[PDB]
Amino acid sequence: NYGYQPLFEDRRPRNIGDTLTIVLQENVSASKSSSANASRDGKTSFGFDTVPRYLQGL
Amino acid sequence: NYGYQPLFEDRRPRNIGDTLTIVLQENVSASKSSSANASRDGKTSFGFDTVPRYLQGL
């Protein structure tokens, strides 16, 4: 005797020793990315090509 | 005598010595991959091409 068995219920595992089908379908995907930047450019100039007389000493 | 045999039930193995057909159809495929990266670039410069007199000592 295997005990009471439901008639219309779907066949499910209920006790120790019962079998069950596992459909292994795994799809995992993780990603991450980052960046940082900094820039600085500086140019400066001053030139006196021709200096008038009253400015010579300066 | 081979005992009671159901008339309309599908022919299934029931006792020791009964035969059963196994259709071997296995298709298993697993995969994994990963990566990591890191980068760092740094450039710095300072130049005094022409130094005025009052700045010379510095």
Q: Give residues with Cβ within 8 angstroms of B20, minimum separation 6.
A: B13
User: Do residues B19 and B13 touch, judged by C-beta distance below 8 A?
Assistant: yes
C-alpha B22 chain-centroid distance: 31
The minimum CA-CA distance between B34 and chain A, rounded to whole Å, is 9
* Number of alpha carbons in the 13 Å side-chain half-sphere of residue A43: 0
Interface membership of A39 toward B (CB under 8 Å): no
Q: What is the spatial distance between Cα A37 and Cα B42, in angstroms, rounded to a whole number?
A: 10
CA angle B15, B19, B21 (to 5 degrees): 135
| Helix, strand, coil share (%) of chain A residues, nearest 5 | 5, 0, 95
- Nearest residue of chain B to residue A34 (CA atoms): B38
> At how many Å resolution was this determined?
3.4
Tokens coding B24: 């071997």
Q: What is the spatial distance between Cα B37 and Cα A32, in angstroms, rounded to a whole number?
A: 11
Q: What is the spatial distance between Cα B58 and Cα B46, in angstroms, rounded to a whole number?
A: 14
Tell me which chain A residues have a C-beta less than 8 angstroms from the C-beta of B28. Answer: 24
